[PDB]
Structure formats: structure tokens, C-alpha cells
Amino acid sequence: HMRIEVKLLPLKDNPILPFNYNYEVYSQILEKVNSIEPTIAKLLSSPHGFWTFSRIIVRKRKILPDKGIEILSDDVSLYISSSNEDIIRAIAEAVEKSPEFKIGELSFLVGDIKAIKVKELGKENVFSTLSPIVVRTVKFEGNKLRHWDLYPHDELFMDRLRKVMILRYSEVMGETPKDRDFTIEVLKFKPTRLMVGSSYIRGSLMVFRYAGSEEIARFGYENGFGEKTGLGFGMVKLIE
RNA sequence: UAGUUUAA
């Protein structure tokens, strides 16, 4: 398990961060790890989800629903996480090498790059969503095959996430997970829709209590929960 | 930041 904080610096003044920055941040991270390691940057774009990143955390904010989030604080930080040590490596160097970010009209400098300590998984534990968890099912509109975004109150929901994890864990850990049973009781929730390119993505910010696997947890902890983790979704933090 | 606008 490896988790890092990347502190960012705003320029110029009265900085305003759009809410769907979500996609771009990932795009730029893919350029940056590309130049220095085109080979490891293939895992970044992998849909099977070898990593996660969080929202850009803004500690002092004024929320102005028209324009975006107001930055009142010196620096804002973003947290990348993953199970295999070598992606974090790539990104550390990659961004420290070309620390120029722009999301919409807000340009960014990479201030320091630290390493976050990983709070030891409990026996039974609780997670807050550090970036909205996504889960989807196939849905047909007439002829073509598109997908439909799920929320915890949809019933299929709990059942996709079981598949989505077991699928993902076998597809990276390389083997089937020993114990496949888990259940998550949902303590909080807010839905969100974020933009990517021309399309939309709906996912569930939420707090919740997970029980029933060492690895499914240790795994969802490192690489996040559900689908599309690579784009900045699924990352969780463990509060108790 | 138990939180972040907009609800196919």
C-alpha cells in the first residue's frame, strides 16, 4: 500500500476551482507519467483500475454555485493511492518533474510531495468517500449498448459492487480473493454528477461501514472502490 | 470535507 499527498499552489489571485475538474487532473497526470515512463502510464489509463485519486481538497472554501469553489487557503492538496509501489513512484517523479497544472482557468504549481501514513485496517471499519464511489450496470437504449450509473438506494447497486470488486481484485492481484463475502452499511450519502469530456458520470459520495474481507478492504482501500477509479473516483479514507 | 454546485 502506498498513499501520497501532492500539495498544490494557486496563481494568480482570487483562485476559483470548477467542480468538474475531475477529468483534466487525470489527463495531465497521464501526460506527466507518460513522458518519464510510457510503460507504467498504461496502467494509469487501464479501465480495470490500478490506482485512485481524490478530490482536490480545499481546506478553506467559499462555495459559490455559479462559478465554483472559492479557495481561501494557502494550499490545496490531492491524494493519490495504489497497491503497487511503482505507480506512486512514477507519479512522484512525473509530477515533481513537470509541476504545472491547469484546471479550467485556474493554473497550479506543485508544492511539496509528501507520503501519507496508511491507517491500519481495523477488523471492522468505516470509510468516508475521498472522491465519489461509482457503480454501473449495462443498460440498452434501443439498439446501442450504454451504461447506467447506480446509487446505494438502487438495489442492483449493492450487487454490482460485489462483482466489480471481485472482478477488479482478481484482475490485478492476479488471483481470486480468498474470501468473497462483504457487506457495506451506508451511514451517509450525497449524489453527484461530474463531467468528463463530452459525457456525464454520476456517483455516490458517502460514509459507510464495511465488514467481511481482509483483502477486499485492503484492496478497495489502496485502489479505491467500484469502477472508474483511475479517473479520480472510489478513493476512500478510513475514519474508524 | 459527515463533504461539492448542477440530477440521465
Give the pairing of strands A183-186 and A207-211: antiparallel
C-alpha cell recorded at residue A113: 510531495
Nearest CA among A51, A35, A40 for reference residue A94 = A35
A170: helix, strand or coil: helix
A78 in Cβ contact with A8 (< 8 Å) = yes
Alpha helices in chain A (DSSP H): 22-36, 41-44, 85-97, 155-170, 214-223
Range list of β-strands (E), chain A:
2-11, 16-17, 52-53, 61-64, 68-71, 76-82, 100-103, 106-116, 125-129, 136-141, 144-149, 183-186, 190-196, 199-205, 207-211, 236-238
Measured CA to CA, the distance from residue A138 to residue A149 in angstroms comes to 9
A114: helix, strand or coil: strand
How many residues belong to chain A? Answer: 240
Q: Which helix (H) or strand (E) holds A123?
A: none
A11: helix, strand or coil: strand
A233 in Cβ contact with A226 (< 8 Å) = yes
Q: Is the peptide bond before A12 cis (omega within 30 degrees of 0)?
A: yes
C-alpha cell recorded at residue A19: 467542480
A205: nt with nearest C1' to CA: B3
The DSSP output letter for A67 is T
C-alpha cell recorded at residue A6: 501532492
The pair phi, psi for residue A61, each rounded to 5°, is -135, 145
Query: To which residue does cell 483562485 refer?
Result: A15
Q: Which nucleotides of B are covered by protein (CB under 7 A)?
A: 1-8
Measured CA to CA, the distance from residue A189 to residue A214 in angstroms comes to 24
Enter the resolution in angstroms: 3.3
Residue type, A26: Y
CA A183, A122, A6, A194: dihedral to nearest 10 degrees?
Answer: 10
Measured CA to CA, the distance from residue A81 to residue A224 in angstroms comes to 8
- Neighbouring C-beta atoms of residue A112, cutoff 10 Å: 12
C-alpha cell recorded at residue A2: 502506498
CA of A95 to C1' of B5 (A): 29
Residue type, A102: K
A19 in Cβ contact with A69 (< 8 Å) = yes
The pair phi, psi for residue A169, each rounded to 5°, is -70, -40
Measured CA to CA, the distance from residue A126 to residue A227 in angstroms comes to 20
According to the entry, how was the structure determined? X-ray
Measured CA to CA, the distance from residue A175 to residue A183 in angstroms comes to 21
Measured CA to CA, the distance from residue A150 to residue A133 in angstroms comes to 10
A226: helix, strand or coil: strand
Query: To which residue does cell 464495511 refer?
Result: A210
Measured CA to CA, the distance from residue A2 to residue A33 in angstroms comes to 17
CA of A45 to C1' of B6 (A): 27
Q: Which structural domains are found in chain A, ordered by start?
A: 1-121 (3.30.70.1890), 122-240 (3.30.70.1900)
The pair phi, psi for residue A72, each rounded to 5°, is -100, -5
Query: Which residues surround strand B, with CB < 7 Å?
Result: A 19-20, 55-61, 63, 65, 69, 126, 128-129, 148-150, 187-194, 200, 202, 205-207, 239
